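Lab meeting, action items carried over

1. Structure of the four-component assembly. Owner: GW. Status: complete.
Input record:
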Amino acid sequence: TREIYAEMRCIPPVVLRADGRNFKNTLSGLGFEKPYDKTFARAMADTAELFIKKSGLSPLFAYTFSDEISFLFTDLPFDGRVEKIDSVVASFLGSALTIKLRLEEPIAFDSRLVALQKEEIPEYFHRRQLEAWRNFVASWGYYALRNEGMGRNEAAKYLKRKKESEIHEMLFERGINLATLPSWQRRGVIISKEAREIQGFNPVSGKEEKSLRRKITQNWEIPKFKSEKGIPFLEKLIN
Amino acid sequence: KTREIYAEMRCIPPVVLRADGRNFKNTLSGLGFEKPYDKTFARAMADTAELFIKKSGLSPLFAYTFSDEISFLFTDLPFDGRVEKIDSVVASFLGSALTIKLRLEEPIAFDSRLVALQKEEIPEYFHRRQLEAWRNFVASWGYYALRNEGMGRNEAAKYLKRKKESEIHEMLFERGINLATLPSWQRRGVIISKEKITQNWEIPKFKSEKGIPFLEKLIN
Amino acid sequence: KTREIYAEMRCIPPVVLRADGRNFKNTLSGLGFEKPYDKTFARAMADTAELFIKKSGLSPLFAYTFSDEISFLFTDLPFDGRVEKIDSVVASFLGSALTIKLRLEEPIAFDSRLVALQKEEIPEYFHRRQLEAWRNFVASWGYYALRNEGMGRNEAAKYLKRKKESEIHEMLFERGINLATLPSWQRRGVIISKEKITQNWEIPKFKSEKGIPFLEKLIN
Amino acid sequence: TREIYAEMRCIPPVVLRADGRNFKNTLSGLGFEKPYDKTFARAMADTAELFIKKSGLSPLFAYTFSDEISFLFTDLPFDGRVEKIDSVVASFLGSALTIKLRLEEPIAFDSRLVALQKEEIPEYFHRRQLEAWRNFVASWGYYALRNEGMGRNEAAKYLKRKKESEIHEMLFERGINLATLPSWQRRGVIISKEAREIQGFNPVSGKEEKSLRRKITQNWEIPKFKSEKGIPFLEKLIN
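Predicted assembly:
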C-alpha cells in the first residue's frame, strides 16, 4: 500500500468546489473583454452544464461566478473516494472549459470537497454568494484604478484599505454605478436539470404529443439566497 | 474553512503522481484511432507530459507514460504537499493539454493519485510500471489478433485470462505477429525529461544492464 | 510540524467514536473471569464509560457498551474535530480507566475509530451495534455449551459457522439454556447517560415500540 | 463505508510521538516532588520499556522526557493504519503508566505520527532533545518563581519574556545552578533492546554457559545527539 490517500473517503452531502488556477495569467493576452467578458461567463456556465450532462456523475445543481464552480452532491460518485472525485471532476472541467473557449494553451482547475451536514447547505451557498458580491466590487474597483494609470500592486494595497461605500465613491467618480450592472455579475449563475410542460408534434410521427421531456437550464437572474424570494428558491433546488 | 476537511491532507517528498485516463476507450472513440495501438494517440500523451513539464510551473524530475497513464516524479513538492491541490490541478492541467493536443470535441478526464515512496524504493516503482506496460502490451495485441479471427468480444476476453503469456505469445507468432520486434514505445513506454525537454521513445528495460544506470541518472 | 501530516485530518459533527478492546481474551486472561460472560468485567466496562463521561472533560451525549466495545455519541466535537487527537486521547483515557476499575497487573489497550454519520442515520448506527451485540451473544453461549460437551477448540468454532442461528438456538434449548431469558445486558448491552449519570442495564431493542422513542430521547 | 479514517495509512519510517495530556492537572495533588520527581521519570522510562516488551509492536527504540515518549518504527504495525496505531499505542501507554504509578484516577496520552524520510530521522531527535532543554529551563524557572510568591499566569508571561541567560541569572539568585543537575533532566532517556556478552551458570543444569541473551536497557546518561559523541550514538540506534 503505497497509494495511501486512495482509500480516503467522504460521506454525503458534499459540495465540490472547483476554482480556476491563476486564470488572470493563463488567460491573459487572449483578448477577453475587461473586467467582465460575457463570452467567458457563458463558457463557465456551459462547462457546468456539460459536466451535468456528460460526466456520468450526478450533481443536483451547479453554482458559478468568476472562476469557480460549486457542485452539490447527494449521490456520491466513485464511492466517495476523495482523490478520485477531486482529480476527475477538476479534469473534466479543465477539458470542457478548454473546448468551450477553444484554448490553445492549457489551463487548470483545483478542486476541494466541502464536508457539510444537510441543514448547513443553504448557508454554504450564502457564503459563496457573499464572495460573489465581494469579487464583483473588487473586479470593477481594480478595473477603474488601472484605467486611472494605477499600478498592479498599488491598486491591490488600495483595495484592501478602503471600504465598500468608499470604493463605491471612487467607482462613481469614474462614471461607474454598480446598481446598473447585470444581476449575474454580482449574484452568479445556477445550472440545474429541470422538467417543464411540453406540448408538440412528434419529430417522426408527427402527431401532437404532451410526452414531457428533461432539460438542463441556466438561470442568469437568480435571487439573493439569503432573502425573502431566495430562501424557497434554494430549498427547492436542494429539496 | 473547517468544512474543507481534506484541504490540509498532506504528503512528504519524494512522491510520484500517477494520472490515468478515465474511460478513454469510450470517450476517445469516434476519433477513429487505429487498433490496437495508434501512434497519434501516443504522441499526444507524450506531448501532453512535455507541455506539463514546460508550462505547469511545477517541477517534476521526469515523466513516464504508456497506454492511458502518465507518472511524474517529484522530489520538490508542489503546493506544500497538499494532496487535494496536487491531484486536482495536475489532472486538470493534463485534461486541458490532451484536449488541445487532440483538438477534442467532447470532454475527457484523467484521475490522479499520489504514490508515497522512500527514496530507495523509487527505481522499483518504475520497474512495476514498466512491467504493467509489458502486460498491457501483450493483452492488447492478443485481443486484437483474436478479434481478427472472428472472435466475439467477451469470448476473446475469456481466452486471454485462461491462457498463459507463453501461449498468447506462441499464438501471436503463428499468425505473423512477433511481440519482440513490435515498436519499443508500445512494449516499454516513453520517458520525457529535461536535458531542453526530450522524449525518449527507445528506452531500456529498467532492471537490465543499461537500464539500471539509466534510471539512476533520471532520479539523480 | 509539516511532518505531522495526519495532525490536521479532521471530522465534522455529529460523530460516533467506537472503542474496542484489543486482544482482551489473551491480555485479561489470568483474571480468571467466568465463562462465557462475567458480570464483573461488564461492570468494569460500564463504569469505565461512566468515568469518561464524568471526568474526561469531553462531552459525549451517551455511551453504549457490550462485549469489549464502547460507542460514544458526540454532537459537540472534542479538539476541534482533530481525528488523531480524538482517537488517541479517548482510547488512552479508556485504557487508563479500565486498568483502574480492574486494578490490572499487566497493560491492556483499546483501539478507536470515528464513524461519520448524518444526523438522520444515527439511530440506524446503534441498531447495527445492538444487532452485533445479539450476534455475539448467540455465538458465545453456543461456543460455551459446545466446549462443555467435550468439543475441541477449533471444532466448536466450525460448528458455529456451519449451522444457522435457529439451530444453535434449538441446540442451546435442548441442553437447558434458554437464550430469551438470559440477562438483558448480555443480549442487548448497557446504556450510560446523563440524567447525574445513570447505567441502564435493561434497555429495549432499539427498533421496537418502546425502543424507537427511547433512542430519540438519548439523541435529543 | 462510514468509517472513513479507518483506511488512512502511513509508510515507514515513522515516529510515533505520545504526549501526556494535561498531566499538570490530572497528576496534581498526588504528592509528586516538584519540579522533578525521579519516581515519575522512572515510571515513564519503565512504561516505554513495558511497551517495547509486551505490546507486540516492534519499535527500534524509545526516547522520553517530561511527559512525552517517541517511538521509532521501521517495521510498521497494523499495516500502517493511522487510526489503529495512534489509538492502540496511546492506550497501551495510558494503561502501562497507570500500572507503574498505581494511579487511582485516569490519565490520557495523545498520539501523533511523524512522517519522516530515513535521512531526516537524526534531525527529528535533535529537535526533540532541543525541546527537552527548553522544558528543563522552563520547569526550573517556573519552580523558582512560584517559590518567590509568584502567581500562575504571572510566572507564565514572565518566562516567555526574558532570555535563557536572564532566566539563568534569576535561577542563580535562588541558589540554582542548572549545570549541577543530572544529565537526564535536560537530555531525556533512551530505552532500547540490547545484546550483551553473557557468561553464567545455567539455572537448571547448572553448567557454565556463554549462550547470549537479550535485554531492554534504559540509558539515563545519553550524549547530546548533535555533537561529536552523539552522532555515532544515534546512528547506531537507528542503523
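2. GW to write a short summary for the group page. Key points so far: The radius of gyration of chain B is 19 Å. Chain B touches chain A through 46 residues (CB under 8 Å).
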